[PDB]
Amino acid sequence: SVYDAAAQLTADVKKDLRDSWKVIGSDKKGNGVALFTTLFADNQETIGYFKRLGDVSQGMANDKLRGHSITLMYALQNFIDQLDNPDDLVCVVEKFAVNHITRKISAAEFGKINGPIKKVLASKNFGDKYANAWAKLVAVVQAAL
Amino acid sequence: SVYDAAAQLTADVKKDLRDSWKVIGSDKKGNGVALFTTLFADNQETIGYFKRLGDVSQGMANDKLRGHSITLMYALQNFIDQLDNPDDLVCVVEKFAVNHITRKISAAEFGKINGPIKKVLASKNFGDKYANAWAKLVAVVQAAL
Ligand code: HEM
Ligand code: HEM
Protein backbone atom coordinates (compact mmCIF):
# COMPACT_ATOMS: atom_id res chain seq x y z
CA SER A 1 0.00 0.00 0.00
CA VAL A 2 0.97 3.68 -0.12
CA TYR A 3 1.26 3.67 3.66
CA ASP A 4 3.73 0.78 3.50
CA ALA A 5 5.72 2.61 0.81
CA ALA A 6 5.85 5.78 2.92
CA ALA A 7 6.48 4.04 6.23
CA GLN A 8 9.58 2.49 4.64
CA LEU A 9 11.43 5.77 3.98
CA THR A 10 14.34 5.51 6.44
CA ALA A 11 16.14 8.22 8.41
CA ASP A 12 19.07 8.16 5.99
CA VAL A 13 16.75 8.50 3.00
CA LYS A 14 14.77 11.34 4.58
CA LYS A 15 18.09 13.01 5.44
CA ASP A 16 19.28 12.78 1.82
CA LEU A 17 15.90 13.99 0.56
CA ARG A 18 15.93 17.01 2.87
CA ASP A 19 19.58 17.88 2.23
CA SER A 20 19.15 17.79 -1.54
CA TRP A 21 15.83 19.68 -1.42
CA LYS A 22 17.48 22.51 0.51
CA VAL A 23 19.32 23.24 -2.72
CA ILE A 24 17.09 22.25 -5.65
CA GLY A 25 14.08 23.54 -3.75
CA SER A 26 15.69 26.95 -3.20
CA ASP A 27 15.05 28.01 -6.80
CA LYS A 28 11.65 26.59 -7.65
CA LYS A 29 11.19 28.59 -10.85
CA GLY A 30 14.58 27.73 -12.31
CA ASN A 31 14.80 24.10 -11.23
CA GLY A 32 11.11 23.48 -11.80
CA VAL A 33 11.30 24.58 -15.43
CA ALA A 34 14.53 22.66 -15.93
CA LEU A 35 12.98 19.51 -14.45
CA PHE A 36 9.85 19.78 -16.57
CA THR A 37 11.60 20.80 -19.80
CA THR A 38 13.99 17.87 -19.38
CA LEU A 39 11.02 15.51 -19.31
CA PHE A 40 10.10 16.67 -22.86
CA ALA A 41 13.51 16.48 -24.39
CA ASP A 42 14.14 12.95 -23.12
CA ASN A 43 10.57 11.63 -23.34
CA GLN A 44 8.97 13.29 -26.36
CA GLU A 45 6.01 10.89 -26.21
CA THR A 46 4.67 12.80 -23.18
CA ILE A 47 4.41 16.18 -24.91
CA GLY A 48 0.85 15.41 -25.99
CA TYR A 49 -0.23 15.12 -22.35
CA PHE A 50 0.48 18.81 -21.77
CA LYS A 51 -1.54 20.42 -24.55
CA ARG A 52 -3.22 22.79 -22.06
CA LEU A 53 0.17 24.43 -21.57
CA GLY A 54 0.43 25.43 -25.23
CA ASP A 55 3.84 25.43 -26.91
CA VAL A 56 6.07 23.91 -24.24
CA SER A 57 9.09 24.51 -26.48
CA GLN A 58 8.86 28.15 -25.40
CA GLY A 59 10.38 27.19 -22.06
CA MET A 60 10.53 29.92 -19.39
CA ALA A 61 8.77 32.39 -21.69
CA ASN A 62 5.61 30.26 -21.67
CA ASP A 63 3.65 31.64 -18.71
CA LYS A 64 1.44 28.54 -18.47
CA LEU A 65 4.49 26.28 -18.41
CA ARG A 66 6.17 28.52 -15.85
CA GLY A 67 3.11 28.51 -13.59
CA HIS A 68 2.79 24.74 -13.91
CA SER A 69 6.48 24.19 -13.15
CA ILE A 70 6.54 26.43 -10.08
CA THR A 71 3.39 24.75 -8.75
CA LEU A 72 4.90 21.30 -9.30
CA MET A 73 7.79 22.24 -7.03
CA TYR A 74 5.35 23.10 -4.24
CA ALA A 75 3.86 19.62 -4.56
CA LEU A 76 7.36 18.34 -3.84
CA GLN A 77 7.70 20.88 -1.01
CA ASN A 78 4.48 19.45 0.42
CA PHE A 79 5.88 15.89 0.26
CA ILE A 80 9.19 16.88 1.85
CA ASP A 81 7.42 18.65 4.74
CA GLN A 82 5.26 15.61 5.53
CA LEU A 83 8.10 13.07 5.69
CA ASP A 84 8.02 12.58 9.46
CA ASN A 85 4.30 11.84 9.49
CA PRO A 86 3.32 8.98 7.10
CA ASP A 87 -0.37 9.59 7.70
CA ASP A 88 -0.08 13.15 6.40
CA LEU A 89 2.28 12.14 3.59
CA VAL A 90 -0.18 9.48 2.50
CA CYS A 91 -3.21 11.76 2.34
CA VAL A 92 -1.37 14.39 0.27
CA VAL A 93 0.12 11.74 -2.02
CA GLU A 94 -3.35 10.32 -2.70
CA LYS A 95 -4.64 13.84 -3.34
CA PHE A 96 -2.02 14.37 -6.01
CA ALA A 97 -2.48 10.87 -7.29
CA VAL A 98 -6.08 11.60 -8.26
CA ASN A 99 -4.89 14.52 -10.42
CA HIS A 100 -2.84 12.07 -12.48
CA ILE A 101 -5.23 9.11 -12.39
CA THR A 102 -7.76 11.40 -14.07
CA ARG A 103 -5.23 12.16 -16.82
CA LYS A 104 -4.71 8.43 -17.34
CA ILE A 105 -1.11 8.51 -16.10
CA SER A 106 0.03 5.02 -15.07
CA ALA A 107 2.52 4.20 -12.32
CA ALA A 108 5.04 3.24 -15.00
CA GLU A 109 4.57 6.54 -16.84
CA PHE A 110 4.84 8.52 -13.62
CA GLY A 111 8.24 6.92 -13.10
CA LYS A 112 9.52 8.69 -16.22
CA ILE A 113 10.18 11.67 -13.94
CA ASN A 114 13.11 9.82 -12.36
CA GLY A 115 15.42 10.56 -15.29
CA PRO A 116 14.80 14.34 -15.12
CA ILE A 117 15.18 14.41 -11.33
CA LYS A 118 18.50 12.57 -11.55
CA LYS A 119 19.77 15.07 -14.12
CA VAL A 120 18.69 18.14 -12.16
CA LEU A 121 20.28 16.67 -9.03
CA ALA A 122 23.51 16.07 -10.97
CA SER A 123 23.60 19.69 -12.14
CA LYS A 124 23.91 20.55 -8.44
CA ASN A 125 26.45 17.78 -7.83
CA PHE A 126 24.11 15.41 -5.99
CA GLY A 127 25.04 11.90 -7.05
CA ASP A 128 23.40 8.50 -7.47
CA LYS A 129 22.75 8.07 -3.73
CA TYR A 130 20.48 11.12 -3.88
CA ALA A 131 18.86 10.02 -7.13
CA ASN A 132 18.04 6.72 -5.44
CA ALA A 133 16.51 8.53 -2.46
CA TRP A 134 14.22 10.51 -4.76
CA ALA A 135 13.22 7.38 -6.68
CA LYS A 136 12.03 6.00 -3.34
CA LEU A 137 9.84 9.06 -2.79
CA VAL A 138 8.46 8.80 -6.33
CA ALA A 139 7.77 5.13 -5.60
CA VAL A 140 5.40 6.24 -2.83
CA VAL A 141 3.32 8.06 -5.42
CA GLN A 142 3.56 5.07 -7.76
CA ALA A 143 2.06 2.84 -5.06
CA ALA A 144 -1.01 5.07 -5.35
CA LEU A 145 -1.33 4.77 -9.14
CA SER B 1 -7.60 42.53 -14.96
CA VAL B 2 -5.39 40.21 -12.92
CA TYR B 3 -2.51 42.58 -13.68
CA ASP B 4 -4.35 45.60 -12.28
CA ALA B 5 -5.27 43.55 -9.20
CA ALA B 6 -1.67 42.41 -8.70
CA ALA B 7 -0.73 46.10 -8.78
CA GLN B 8 -2.94 46.61 -5.71
CA LEU B 9 -0.39 44.66 -3.64
CA THR B 10 1.65 47.57 -2.28
CA ALA B 11 4.62 47.44 0.09
CA ASP B 12 2.39 47.73 3.16
CA VAL B 13 0.00 45.03 1.94
CA LYS B 14 2.83 42.62 1.15
CA LYS B 15 4.34 43.22 4.60
CA ASP B 16 1.10 42.38 6.40
CA LEU B 17 0.58 39.28 4.27
CA ARG B 18 4.09 38.09 5.15
CA ASP B 19 3.92 38.90 8.85
CA SER B 20 0.57 37.13 9.21
CA TRP B 21 1.60 34.20 7.01
CA LYS B 22 4.56 33.48 9.28
CA VAL B 23 2.01 32.67 11.98
CA ILE B 24 -0.87 31.01 10.11
CA GLY B 25 1.43 29.18 7.70
CA SER B 26 3.36 27.57 10.57
CA ASP B 27 0.57 25.00 11.05
CA LYS B 28 -0.79 24.20 7.59
CA LYS B 29 -2.71 21.11 8.66
CA GLY B 30 -4.40 22.70 11.66
CA ASN B 31 -5.15 26.08 10.11
CA GLY B 32 -5.96 24.60 6.72
CA VAL B 33 -8.67 22.33 8.11
CA ALA B 34 -9.91 25.25 10.22
CA LEU B 35 -10.48 27.26 7.04
CA PHE B 36 -12.75 24.61 5.53
CA THR B 37 -14.67 23.60 8.62
CA THR B 38 -15.47 27.30 8.81
CA LEU B 39 -16.33 27.68 5.12
CA PHE B 40 -18.79 24.76 5.21
CA ALA B 41 -20.20 25.91 8.54
CA ASP B 42 -20.85 29.50 7.46
CA ASN B 43 -21.69 28.79 3.82
CA GLN B 44 -23.42 25.41 3.67
CA GLU B 45 -24.42 26.02 0.06
CA THR B 46 -20.81 25.44 -1.00
CA ILE B 47 -20.68 21.86 0.31
CA GLY B 48 -22.04 20.46 -2.95
CA TYR B 49 -18.90 21.50 -4.85
CA PHE B 50 -16.87 19.17 -2.63
CA LYS B 51 -18.54 15.82 -3.32
CA ARG B 52 -15.19 14.11 -3.93
CA LEU B 53 -14.07 14.73 -0.34
CA GLY B 54 -16.99 12.76 1.07
CA ASP B 55 -18.42 13.69 4.46
CA VAL B 56 -16.70 16.98 5.25
CA SER B 57 -18.46 17.34 8.62
CA GLN B 58 -15.90 14.79 9.83
CA GLY B 59 -13.23 17.47 9.65
CA MET B 60 -9.70 16.39 10.58
CA ALA B 61 -10.75 12.72 10.67
CA ASN B 62 -11.55 12.80 6.94
CA ASP B 63 -8.30 11.91 5.10
CA LYS B 64 -9.45 13.45 1.82
CA LEU B 65 -10.38 16.73 3.50
CA ARG B 66 -7.06 16.82 5.37
CA GLY B 67 -5.06 16.15 2.20
CA HIS B 68 -7.10 18.80 0.41
CA SER B 69 -6.64 21.34 3.21
CA ILE B 70 -2.89 20.88 3.52
CA THR B 71 -2.50 21.22 -0.26
CA LEU B 72 -4.52 24.43 -0.25
CA MET B 73 -2.14 25.96 2.29
CA TYR B 74 0.72 25.24 -0.11
CA ALA B 75 -1.07 27.22 -2.82
CA LEU B 76 -1.15 30.19 -0.44
CA GLN B 77 2.53 29.58 0.36
CA ASN B 78 3.17 29.71 -3.41
CA PHE B 79 1.41 33.09 -3.70
CA ILE B 80 3.33 34.57 -0.76
CA ASP B 81 6.65 33.43 -2.25
CA GLN B 82 5.79 35.08 -5.59
CA LEU B 83 5.00 38.52 -4.16
CA ASP B 84 8.43 39.84 -5.17
CA ASN B 85 7.68 39.16 -8.84
CA PRO B 86 4.24 40.14 -10.22
CA ASP B 87 4.83 38.24 -13.46
CA ASP B 88 5.34 35.00 -11.56
CA LEU B 89 2.49 35.67 -9.14
CA VAL B 90 0.17 36.14 -12.11
CA CYS B 91 1.11 32.88 -13.82
CA VAL B 92 0.59 30.80 -10.67
CA VAL B 93 -2.71 32.55 -9.94
CA GLU B 94 -3.97 31.80 -13.44
CA LYS B 95 -2.91 28.16 -13.01
CA PHE B 96 -5.07 27.76 -9.88
CA ALA B 97 -7.85 29.82 -11.44
CA VAL B 98 -8.24 27.15 -14.14
CA ASN B 99 -8.66 24.52 -11.42
CA HIS B 100 -11.72 26.47 -10.25
CA ILE B 101 -13.03 27.59 -13.63
CA THR B 102 -13.31 23.88 -14.47
CA ARG B 103 -15.37 23.34 -11.32
CA LYS B 104 -17.62 26.23 -12.35
CA ILE B 105 -16.52 28.41 -9.44
CA SER B 106 -17.28 32.11 -9.97
CA ALA B 107 -15.43 35.12 -8.59
CA ALA B 108 -18.34 35.81 -6.23
CA GLU B 109 -18.31 32.32 -4.74
CA PHE B 110 -14.53 32.21 -4.57
CA GLY B 111 -14.82 35.35 -2.47
CA LYS B 112 -16.74 33.43 0.20
CA ILE B 113 -13.34 32.33 1.50
CA ASN B 114 -12.78 35.84 2.91
CA GLY B 115 -15.05 35.12 5.86
CA PRO B 116 -13.12 32.02 6.99
CA ILE B 117 -9.77 33.77 6.49
CA LYS B 118 -10.87 36.68 8.68
CA LYS B 119 -12.06 34.27 11.38
CA VAL B 120 -8.88 32.19 11.30
CA LEU B 121 -6.76 35.34 11.43
CA ALA B 122 -8.88 36.74 14.27
CA SER B 123 -8.36 33.54 16.26
CA LYS B 124 -4.61 34.25 16.08
CA ASN B 125 -5.04 37.89 17.14
CA PHE B 126 -4.72 39.39 13.66
CA GLY B 127 -7.48 41.94 13.08
CA ASP B 128 -9.28 43.57 10.15
CA LYS B 129 -6.06 45.19 8.91
CA TYR B 130 -4.73 41.72 8.09
CA ALA B 131 -8.06 40.35 6.88
CA ASN B 132 -8.18 43.21 4.39
CA ALA B 133 -4.63 42.53 3.19
CA TRP B 134 -5.65 38.94 2.47
CA ALA B 135 -8.84 40.09 0.76
CA LYS B 136 -6.61 41.90 -1.73
CA LEU B 137 -4.66 38.73 -2.48
CA VAL B 138 -7.90 36.80 -2.97
CA ALA B 139 -8.98 39.64 -5.27
CA VAL B 140 -6.10 38.77 -7.59
CA VAL B 141 -7.48 35.26 -8.05
CA GLN B 142 -11.03 36.59 -8.46
CA ALA B 143 -9.83 38.76 -11.34
CA ALA B 144 -8.80 35.58 -13.15
CA LEU B 145 -12.12 33.76 -12.75
C1 HEM C 1 7.68 14.68 -9.41
C2 HEM C 1 6.51 14.14 -10.03
C3 HEM C 1 5.35 14.87 -10.36
C4 HEM C 1 4.69 15.77 -9.58
C5 HEM C 1 4.97 16.11 -8.11
C6 HEM C 1 3.54 16.26 -10.39
C7 HEM C 1 2.69 17.31 -9.99
C8 HEM C 1 1.64 17.81 -10.73
C9 HEM C 1 0.74 18.87 -10.28
C10 HEM C 1 0.80 19.64 -8.96
C11 HEM C 1 -0.15 19.05 -11.28
C12 HEM C 1 -1.32 20.01 -11.31
C13 HEM C 1 -2.59 19.23 -10.99
C14 HEM C 1 -3.84 20.00 -11.35
O1 HEM C 1 -3.93 21.19 -10.99
O2 HEM C 1 -4.74 19.41 -11.98
C15 HEM C 1 0.18 18.12 -12.35
C16 HEM C 1 -0.54 17.97 -13.54
C17 HEM C 1 -0.26 17.05 -14.56
N1 HEM C 1 0.76 16.09 -14.51
FE1 HEM C 1 2.12 15.85 -13.05
N2 HEM C 1 3.47 15.60 -11.59
C18 HEM C 1 4.60 14.77 -11.61
C19 HEM C 1 4.94 13.94 -12.69
C20 HEM C 1 4.24 13.79 -13.87
C21 HEM C 1 4.62 12.90 -14.97
C22 HEM C 1 5.85 11.98 -14.98
C23 HEM C 1 3.66 13.02 -15.94
C24 HEM C 1 3.66 12.50 -17.25
C25 HEM C 1 4.05 11.18 -17.65
C26 HEM C 1 2.65 13.93 -15.40
C27 HEM C 1 1.50 14.36 -16.11
C28 HEM C 1 0.64 15.38 -15.69
C29 HEM C 1 -0.47 15.90 -16.49
C30 HEM C 1 -0.93 15.42 -17.87
C31 HEM C 1 -1.00 16.95 -15.80
C32 HEM C 1 -2.07 17.92 -16.31
C33 HEM C 1 -1.46 19.22 -16.82
C34 HEM C 1 -2.50 20.26 -17.16
O3 HEM C 1 -3.24 20.07 -18.15
O4 HEM C 1 -2.58 21.27 -16.43
N3 HEM C 1 3.04 14.43 -14.17
N4 HEM C 1 1.28 17.35 -11.99
C1 HEM D 1 -7.90 30.90 -0.68
C2 HEM D 1 -8.69 30.46 -1.79
C3 HEM D 1 -8.58 29.21 -2.41
C4 HEM D 1 -7.45 28.57 -2.86
C5 HEM D 1 -6.02 29.10 -2.82
C6 HEM D 1 -7.86 27.31 -3.45
C7 HEM D 1 -6.96 26.30 -3.84
C8 HEM D 1 -7.33 25.05 -4.35
C9 HEM D 1 -6.42 24.00 -4.74
C10 HEM D 1 -4.88 24.04 -4.69
C11 HEM D 1 -7.18 22.96 -5.17
C12 HEM D 1 -6.72 21.64 -5.76
C13 HEM D 1 -6.73 21.74 -7.28
C14 HEM D 1 -6.75 20.38 -7.95
O1 HEM D 1 -5.95 19.51 -7.54
O2 HEM D 1 -7.57 20.18 -8.87
C15 HEM D 1 -8.57 23.37 -5.06
C16 HEM D 1 -9.66 22.57 -5.42
C17 HEM D 1 -10.99 22.99 -5.38
N1 HEM D 1 -11.41 24.26 -4.97
FE1 HEM D 1 -10.33 25.76 -4.22
N2 HEM D 1 -9.24 27.22 -3.44
C18 HEM D 1 -9.70 28.36 -2.78
C19 HEM D 1 -11.05 28.67 -2.54
C20 HEM D 1 -12.11 27.92 -3.00
C21 HEM D 1 -13.52 28.25 -2.77
C22 HEM D 1 -13.98 29.40 -1.88
C23 HEM D 1 -14.27 27.32 -3.44
C24 HEM D 1 -15.67 27.16 -3.48
C25 HEM D 1 -16.66 28.21 -3.28
C26 HEM D 1 -13.33 26.43 -4.08
C27 HEM D 1 -13.67 25.29 -4.80
C28 HEM D 1 -12.79 24.26 -5.18
C29 HEM D 1 -13.23 22.98 -5.67
C30 HEM D 1 -14.67 22.58 -5.99
C31 HEM D 1 -12.14 22.18 -5.78
C32 HEM D 1 -12.15 20.72 -6.21
C33 HEM D 1 -12.09 19.80 -5.00
C34 HEM D 1 -11.88 18.34 -5.39
O3 HEM D 1 -12.82 17.72 -5.94
O4 HEM D 1 -10.78 17.83 -5.15
N3 HEM D 1 -12.01 26.78 -3.74
N4 HEM D 1 -8.66 24.65 -4.57
Side-chain angles (χ1 to χ4, degrees):
Chain A
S1 68
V2 186
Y3 193 68
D4 288 306
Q8 75 90 291
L9 296 169
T10 66
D12 303 315
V13 172
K14 293 178 178 180
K15 169 61 174 172
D16 288 331
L17 287 171
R18 298 198 248 255
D19 285 350
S20 60
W21 185 244
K22 279 188 179 176
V23 177
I24 61 179
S26 73
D27 178 15
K28 297 183 170 62
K29 174 169 61 178
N31 294 323
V33 169
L35 211 187
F36 208 57
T37 59
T38 293
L39 181 64
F40 297 140
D42 298 354
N43 295 81
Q44 302 94 313
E45 75 279 4
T46 68
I47 293 175
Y49 286 133
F50 304 99
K51 61 185 192 66
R52 184 189 77 75
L53 305 185
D55 186 352
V56 299
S57 79
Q58 301 293 165
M60 192 71 82
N62 184 326
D63 64 309
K64 283 189 168 58
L65 174 51
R66 197 169 65 256
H68 170 80
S69 304
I70 293 174
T71 303
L72 177 153
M73 296 296 271
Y74 279 98
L76 294 183
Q77 179 72 56
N78 195 341
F79 295 171
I80 296 296
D81 291 335
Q82 317 311 319
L83 293 182
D84 296 316
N85 192 327
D87 291 308
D88 296 326
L89 178 60
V90 171
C91 75
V92 299
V93 160
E94 297 191 305
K95 179 277 181 297
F96 281 114
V98 174
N99 291 144
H100 295 75
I101 286 169
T102 57
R103 267 73 177 221
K104 308 312 304 172
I105 303 301
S106 69
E109 300 176 275
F110 191 95
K112 288 177 177 177
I113 199 65
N114 282 314
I117 291 177
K118 179 172 178 177
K119 290 187 159 183
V120 174
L121 283 170
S123 71
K124 294 306 191 306
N125 298 103
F126 284 103
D128 296 319
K129 169 166 164 281
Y130 292 98
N132 291 159
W134 279 87
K136 290 177 172 301
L137 178 58
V138 173
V140 176
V141 180
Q142 288 174 301
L145 303 168
Chain B
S1 178
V2 62
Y3 291 96
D4 286 325
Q8 285 168 211
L9 302 178
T10 59
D12 301 331
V13 175
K14 292 190 293 185
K15 194 76 177 76
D16 296 327
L17 286 171
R18 292 190 201 284
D19 291 335
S20 58
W21 182 248
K22 185 190 299 183
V23 176
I24 63 175
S26 62
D27 174 22
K28 299 182 178 62
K29 178 167 62 174
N31 291 322
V33 173
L35 283 175
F36 286 84
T37 42
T38 303
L39 177 65
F40 304 142
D42 299 336
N43 289 85
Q44 274 191 180
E45 76 281 3
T46 62
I47 294 181
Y49 291 118
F50 297 94
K51 283 188 171 188
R52 188 188 79 73
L53 307 182
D55 185 13
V56 302
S57 74
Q58 301 171 180
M60 189 70 76
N62 183 315
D63 294 333
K64 287 185 170 62
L65 178 52
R66 194 169 68 270
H68 172 72
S69 298
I70 293 172
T71 303
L72 179 147
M73 293 301 275
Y74 277 101
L76 297 184
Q77 177 73 57
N78 190 339
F79 297 159
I80 293 302
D81 287 342
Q82 311 319 318
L83 291 181
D84 285 313
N85 190 311
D87 290 308
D88 292 339
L89 173 60
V90 171
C91 77
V92 294
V93 168
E94 295 186 306
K95 183 276 180 296
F96 289 118
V98 169
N99 296 148
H100 297 78
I101 293 174
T102 63
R103 270 76 175 220
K104 286 292 300 169
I105 305 305
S106 72
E109 284 222 74
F110 190 85
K112 293 178 178 179
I113 200 68
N114 283 146
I117 291 180
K118 188 160 72 72
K119 295 190 176 183
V120 174
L121 288 173
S123 75
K124 322 302 292 193
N125 217 320
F126 284 88
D128 290 40
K129 167 191 169 184
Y130 293 96
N132 292 155
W134 280 88
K136 292 215 169 187
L137 181 56
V138 171
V140 181
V141 182
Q142 293 177 294
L145 295 176

